[PDB]
């Protein structure tokens, strides 16, 4: 990033440590007015996304105690999990756009090669999708 | 609610299945000018426009795509379309916030 | 005279014709020079006012001396770019003669 800024270490390390005020950084986070906790969407996957969210929130709890696309829309209407982790193989998947997630795996396809593809490019999702 | 739909010869389709879209136009950003920005106008929604099989011209079906109308006040505009019995999408005037400026703040240290 | 075409798609011929007969769609030359892709015009709407004749900064389009080209079929009126060039080829000594005889008054 273009500007001067402090660099930290590793997830559970610096996160849970500052969360437990082990980090000196936790102190400056304490004296700070209207602190801001910026957690990226990319960080949440990373094998154990929930653990990171729990750690960062703790930091939010501490500050309060001391005092002084296709994403946010669905969660505005509760389409969670959102992740494809429900499976449990389910026949006849219905792509709105498999150009993105079609790169992943077609594991349901031998069980059911059929895939409706409602895209707007022949990229990725179209070739591996019937209809 | 002075509806005048019968008086205008306009076909029902275009007092119905389309909407006006009142707004004060944004400054062209390439420009530094401000003049054209002000004063409400009453653009309609776009419809289909294909292509001439010959010569490639943009042949067009909709009766009234190019129509546009200036105004002095928004309330007058909304009331205007109401007199016409028009569906509408009023949008806020979005004047830029005033900003502090200082030639010497560039020379703090 | 070099044999290169004059038109450079400043496109204001479109922008000043009252009948708006003209339609232009420029795209870059491979060399990178500005050029038209489908300059076209249609005598069906053109009113022969000669605003285009005035407007062109590089003096490309010119209202030629020829006055007779009445034709059988409407589709022929709607000149393509290539057609205009062919007209420019047919008459060039003539047109250059008129402009030579006239420009000082402009």
């Amino acid at each position: 990033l273009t500007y001067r800024y402090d660099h930290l270490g590793d997830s559970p390390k610096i996160l849970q440590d500052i969360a437990s005020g082990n980090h000196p950084f936790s102190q400056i986070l304490k004296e700070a007015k209207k602190p801001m906790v910026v957690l990226g969407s990319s960080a949440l996957q990373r094998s154990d996304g929930t653990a990171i969210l729990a750690a960062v929130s703790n930091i939010a709890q501490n500050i309060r105690l001391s005092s002084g696309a296709s994403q946010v829309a669905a969660l505005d209407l509760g389409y969670k999990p959102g992740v494809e982790a429900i499976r449990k193989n389910p026949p006849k998947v219905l792509f709105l756009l498999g150009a993105d997630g079609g790169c992943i795996t077609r594991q349901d396809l031998p069980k059911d090669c059929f895939i409706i593809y409602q895209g707007h490019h022949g990229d990725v999702g179209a070739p591996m999708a019937d209809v | 609610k002075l509806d005048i739909t019968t008086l205008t010869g306009v076909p029902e389709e275009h007092i119905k299945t389309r909407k006006v879209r009142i707004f004060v136009p944004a400054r062209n950003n390439m420009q530094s000018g401000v003049n054209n920005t002000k004063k409400w106008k009453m653009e309609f929604d776009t419809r289909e426009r294909w292509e001439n099989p010959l010569m490639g011209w943009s042949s067009t079906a909709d009766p009234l795509s190019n129509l546009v109308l200036t105004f002095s006040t928004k309330e007058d505009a909304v009331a205007f379309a109401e007199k016409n019995g028009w569906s509408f999408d009023v949008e806020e005037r979005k004047v830029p916030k005033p900003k502090s400026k200082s030639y010497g703040a560039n020379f703090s240290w | 005279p070099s044999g290169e075409e004059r038109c450079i798609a400043c496109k204001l011929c479109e922008a000043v014709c009252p009948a708006q007969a003209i339609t232009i769609e420029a795209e870059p030359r491979a060399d990178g020079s500005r050029r038209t892709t489908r300059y076209d015009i249609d005598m069906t709407k053109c009113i022969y006012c000669g605003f285009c004749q005035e407007a062109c900064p590089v003096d490309a389009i010119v209202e030629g001396p020829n006055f007779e080209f009445s034709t059988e079929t409407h589709e022929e009126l709607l000149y393509n770019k290539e057609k205009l060039l062919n007209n420019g080829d047919k008459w060039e000594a003539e047109i250059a003669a008129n402009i030579q005889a006239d420009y000082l008054y402009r």
Partner: peptide
């Protein structure tokens, strides 16, 4: 006749199966 080639150049499905 029409001048200035094409427009969208939409893509088409591959010859190969699956």
């Amino acid at each position: 006749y029409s001048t200035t080639r094409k427009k969208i150049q939409e893509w088409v499905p591959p010859s190969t199966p699956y």
